[PDB]
Amino acid sequence: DVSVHEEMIADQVRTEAYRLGILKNWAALRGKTVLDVGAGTGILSIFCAQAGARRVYAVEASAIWQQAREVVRLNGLEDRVHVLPGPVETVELPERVDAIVSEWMGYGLLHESMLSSVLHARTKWLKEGGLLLPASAELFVAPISDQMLEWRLGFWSQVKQHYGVDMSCMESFATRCLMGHSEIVVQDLSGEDVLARPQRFAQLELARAGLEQELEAGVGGRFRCSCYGSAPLHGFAVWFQVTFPGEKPLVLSTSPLHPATHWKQALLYLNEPVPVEQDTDISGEITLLPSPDNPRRLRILLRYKVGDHEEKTKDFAM
Amino acid sequence: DVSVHEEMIADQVRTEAYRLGILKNWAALRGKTVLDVGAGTGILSIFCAQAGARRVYAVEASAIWQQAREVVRLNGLEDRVHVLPGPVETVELPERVDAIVSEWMGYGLLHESMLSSVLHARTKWLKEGGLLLPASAELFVAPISDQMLEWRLGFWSQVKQHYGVDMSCMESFATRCLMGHSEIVVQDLSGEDVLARPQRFAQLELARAGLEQELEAGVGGRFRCSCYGSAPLHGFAVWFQVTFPGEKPLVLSTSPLHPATHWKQALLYLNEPVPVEQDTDISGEITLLPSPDNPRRLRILLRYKVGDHEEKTKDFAM
Ligand SMILES: Nc1ncnc2c1ncn2[C@@H]1O[C@H](CSCC[C@H](N)C(=O)O)[C@@H](O)[C@H]1O
Ligand SMILES: Nc1ncnc2c1ncn2[C@@H]1O[C@H](CSCC[C@H](N)C(=O)O)[C@@H](O)[C@H]1O
Numbered sequence: 001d002v003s004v005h006e007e008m009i010a011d012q013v014r015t016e017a018y019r020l021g022i023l024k025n026w027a028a029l030r031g032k033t034v035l036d037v038g039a040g041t042g043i044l045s046i047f048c049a050q051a052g053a054r055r056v057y058a059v060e061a062s063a064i065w066q067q068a069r070e071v072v073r074l075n076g077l078e079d080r081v082h083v084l085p086g087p088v089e090t091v092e093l094p095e096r097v098d099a100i101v102s103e104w105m106g107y108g109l110l111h112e113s114m115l116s117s118v119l120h121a122r123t124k125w126l127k128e129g130g131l132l133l134p135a136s137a138e139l140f141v142a143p144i145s146d147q148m149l150e151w152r153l154g155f156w157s158q159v160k161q162h163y164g165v166d167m168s169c170m171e172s173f174a175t176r177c178l179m180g181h182s183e184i185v186v187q188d189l190s191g192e193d194v195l196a197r198p199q200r201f202a203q204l205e206l207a208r209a210g211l212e213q214e215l216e217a218g219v220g221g222r223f224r225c226s227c228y229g230s231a232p233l234h235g236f237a238v239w240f241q242v243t244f245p246g247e248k249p250l251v252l253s254t255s256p257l258h259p260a261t262h263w264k265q266a267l268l269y270l271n272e273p274v275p276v277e278q279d280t281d282i283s284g285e286i287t288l289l290p291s292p293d294n295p296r297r298l299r300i301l302l303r304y305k306v307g308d309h310e311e312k313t314k315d316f317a318m
Numbered sequence: 319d320v321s322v323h324e325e326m327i328a329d330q331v332r333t334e335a336y337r338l339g340i341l342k343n344w345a346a347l348r349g350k351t352v353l354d355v356g357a358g359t360g361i362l363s364i365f366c367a368q369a370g371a372r373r374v375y376a377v378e379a380s381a382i383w384q385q386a387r388e389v390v391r392l393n394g395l396e397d398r399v400h401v402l403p404g405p406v407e408t409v410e411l412p413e414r415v416d417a418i419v420s421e422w423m424g425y426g427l428l429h430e431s432m433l434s435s436v437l438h439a440r441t442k443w444l445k446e447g448g449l450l451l452p453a454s455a456e457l458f459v460a461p462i463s464d465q466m467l468e469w470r471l472g473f474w475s476q477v478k479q480h481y482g483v484d485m486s487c488m489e490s491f492a493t494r495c496l497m498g499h500s501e502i503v504v505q506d507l508s509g510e511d512v513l514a515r516p517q518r519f520a521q522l523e524l525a526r527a528g529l530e531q532e533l534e535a536g537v538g539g540r541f542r543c544s545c546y547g548s549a550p551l552h553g554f555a556v557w558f559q560v561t562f563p564g565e566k567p568l569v570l571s572t573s574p575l576h577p578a579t580h581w582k583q584a585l586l587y588l589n590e591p592v593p594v595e596q597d598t599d600i601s602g603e604i605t606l607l608p609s610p611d612n613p614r615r616l617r618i619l620l621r622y623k624v625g626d627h628e629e630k631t632k633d634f635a636m
Contacts (some may be wrong), residue, residue: 004496009477009485019481025621046483070487152324159327163337165364167327169388177320 005041005064011262014103015043017252021133021244022047022101028051028131029099037102038114040070044101047281049077056081057097059088088121099131107186108266109137109240110219110288111298111318116217119212123236132206134242140255141223141238142198143282144189145231146267152178153273179234179269184300184318188264189237189256190236195276196225198255201286218301220287226282232273233306238266238286268302268316280307291317322348323359323382326482332421333361335570338364339451339562340419346449347417348370355406355420355439356432360386360399362419367395375415377406379440387499406439417449425504427558428585428606429616429636437530449526452560459541459556459574460495460516461600462507463549464585468498471591481514497552497587502618502636506582507555507574513594514543516573517603536619545598550591551624556604568599586620586634598625610634 009015013059022029024046030052036045039058045068045209048056058068058081067085069118084091104114116317122132142205156170200219227233237256240263244250284304291297305311327333340347340362354363366374376386376399376440382504389402403410418439421621423430440450474488514599519539522529545551555574558581572581594600602622610617616636624631 001493006473006492007636010473012480017480041485041488043477043481043483043485050482067488067491071483071485074484074487157329159361162330163333163361164368165361165389166392167359167361167389168357169392170323170385173385174324176319268547 001062001064007262008040008103009043013259013261014252014263016045016121016233017250018103018291019047020052021250021252024244024246024250025099033097034099034101035059035088035093035097035121035125037082037100037118038104039068039312040064040069040103042083044103045081045083046072046075046077048099048101049081053099054080057093058085059091060085061087061160061248090266092130093281096124096131098127098227099133100126101133102215105137105240105242105263105295107263107318108184108238108288108298108300109139110267111184112296114230115215116212118206122207131245133244135206135245137204137206137240137242138200139202139219139238139240139288140198140200141236141286142226142246143195143225143233143276144193144235144237144267145195146189146234147193148187148269149178149234149269150232152274177274181269181273181274182314182316184298184316185267185269186264187265187267188260191257193237193256194228194229194232196227198257199223199225199306215288216295218286218287218289219299222285223279224283227276227278227282230275232275233270233276233282234273235267236286236302236304238300239263255291266298266300268300270314274306274309276306282306284311293317305310319380319382325580325609326358326421327361331577331579332570332581334408335562335568336362336421337365338371338557339568339570342562342564342568343417343449343451344369350416351375351413352417352419353377353411353420353443355405355436355438356422356498357386357401358382358421360389360401362421363399363401364393366417366419366636367399371396371417375411376401377409378403383558407437411443412443415443415448416445417451418444419451423455423558423560423581424616425581425636426502426556426606426616426618427457428533429502429584433533434530436524440525449563451530451562452570455522455524455558455560456518457520457537457556457558457606458516458518459554461513461543461545461594462511462553462555462585463513464505464507464552465511466505467496467587468550468591479488493590497591498589499587500632500634502616502634503585504582504585505585506578507585509556511574512546512611513549513551514545514600516575517541517543521607529541534608534613536605536607538603538619540601540603542599542601545594545596545600548593548595551588551594551600552586552622553587554604554622556586556618557581563564584616584618586630586632588620592624593628594624600624602629611635
């Protein structure tokens with residue numbers, strides 16, 4: 001399971017955003033106490049120590065918690081950073097904390113996310129008015145024309161001019177097995193894939209009352225946009241940003257218009273591509289939900305209407 | 319399961335080698351009959367038709383056989399190319415064939431390979447003295463210093479100079495979970511990863527008597543080489559080439575010194591890296607075997623001796 005951890009640390013967008021987001025709240029943190037929810041190899045808890053926190057409680061449910069303690073002691077912080085195995089729901093802290101830091105976002109923000117555990121620790125261990133790092137998250141959606149997908153698909157109709165065998169029929173086949181499903185696809189896109197202006201359909205203040213509730217009811221909203229031009233619409237892409245309070249706030253973004261993160265994007269393919277043109281109106285509603293299977297697994301309910309085609313519904317799951 | 323098929327056709331090294339290997343045996347094929355063992359989307363069977371074969375029997379055990387028949391008819395060959403579902407072991411051909419063509423090589427040549435089915439069809443359906451495309455395969459091994467691996471590993475000792483947190487201890491951890499296992503790793507290397515001259519340890523004439531036997535006993539041999547210089551030896555890499563008879567023969571190679579194919583290479587990591595230097599002698603024996611679990615799954619038995627360190631044994635499986 002190392003691959004997941006090198007991928008995080010090699011994500012300098014993620015790592016620096018947190019380093020700086022923590023540093024810039026040095027005033028809120030200095031000589032105070034932090035709870036790091038899901039500390040992994042512990043780097044965040046050490047950032048907090050370096051921002052002058054008097055004491056940091058690094059709680060990590062997985063086996064990797066042993067590296068963190070090893071990472072803490074190697075960094076000379078066995079005295080102020082305390083690593084604690086076990087889920088945060090039942091860990092026992094000696095005191096309540098001034099701030100929670102956590103890297104809880106999963107793919108599509110909420111897949112296999114620790115947001116619930118963060119809120120739990122907020123209720124149970126965070127002092128009144130306490131700090132949350134990051135403090136909010138915004139969710140975005142844009143229609144896409146996946147350039148990688150168009151290449152994969154249209155390629156079978158290219159085989160003739162490369163080897164002299166017509167394999168055009170395989171494009172139907174490819175489409176059905178690449179788009180005619182309802183899984184959520186994690187793929188990194190670029191701006192060249194974006195087909196209308198990105199629309200922010202939800203905002204979560206982490207500290208706000210009722211958030212655990214909405215997480216269970218479904219997080220989302222409606223959206224409306226106009227295509228940039230003519231292409232096959234392949235579906236939609238969802239991503240997020242999280243914001244650290246400052247001064248001007250530090251934002252960590254996973255948009256395809258911004259530098260690539262390990263989160264990439266969550267793609268919602270239609271069952272087949274749709275020809276769109278300049279100023280084709282697309283609207284709909286998009287909802288992130290727990291799976292009845294397993295709330296750890298992200299469900300996304302999409303209702304969309306393309307131009308004046310009839311409105312459709314597609315129900316995705318990770 | 320489309321991904322496997324686009325990956326083959328987008329492998330122009332594989333596809334062109336076969337196209338040309340088939341074409342160059344036009345004299346052997348023209349107006350004669352071919353059996354294509356494991357025809358997939360059928361492109362090979364059409365190459366044969368284009369090389370003038372009077373009749374081609376495309377046998378494909380998976381569901382994809384329907385695309386092939388669709389591919390054949392779209393290419394106007396419903397009359398000479400016959401697609402037949404079901405394993406080749408029990409298909410019923412109207413006649414015996416003049417030639418077998420097959421893309422039977424799997425990762426490490428023999429993982430999930432159809433070599434046995436090819437030999438079966440050779441015995442049952444191939445006329446006396448009949449043609450085999452490809453006709454032989456050679457196996458190669460070279461010691462490697464995996465540059466990607468060295469980066470992954472040494473990176474934890476770099477974290478300090480990038481974020482100011484010492485994470486050197488995670489290098490031990492990474493090593494154990496990246497090398498302290500016995501799976502065969504499929505990875506594409508380059509020549510920059512090769513650490514001594516590649517050694518060919520086995521040759522299989524596909525047509526030769528006793529081959530099915532050796533496949534069950536184990537295919538391999540000893541090898542001896544001398545390192546190019548100072549680096550961490552991470553283990554070995556196995557690959558293959560197959561040869562089409564011609565004139566000078568056409569060779570399709572999966573060596574890291576040659577253009578990348580979808581087969582890449584099969585890597586055999588030691589439990590930890592070994593410092594080697596210029597002219598460090600490395601020898602050993604390497605054997606490809608069926609797994610007792612499942613002969614479809616490739617097993618590789620490595621015995622090696624590095625310099626004058628004691629000889630070691632490592633038993634890998636896909
Ligand atoms: N309820 C919970 N209590 C404690 N840890 C949890 C948890 N749910 C998930 N986790 C852990 O939270 C971690 C998030 S990924 C680790 C990120 C960490 N900030 C780092 O830099 O390494 C995972 O290790 C996961 O095992
Ligand atoms: N015993 C068997 N009989 C028939 N097909 C088999 C087989 N064992 C494996 N196969 C099939 O052989 C194919 C090899 S991959 C397909 C390669 C093919 N030449 C192409 O260009 O598409 C796979 O589809 C696999 O399903």
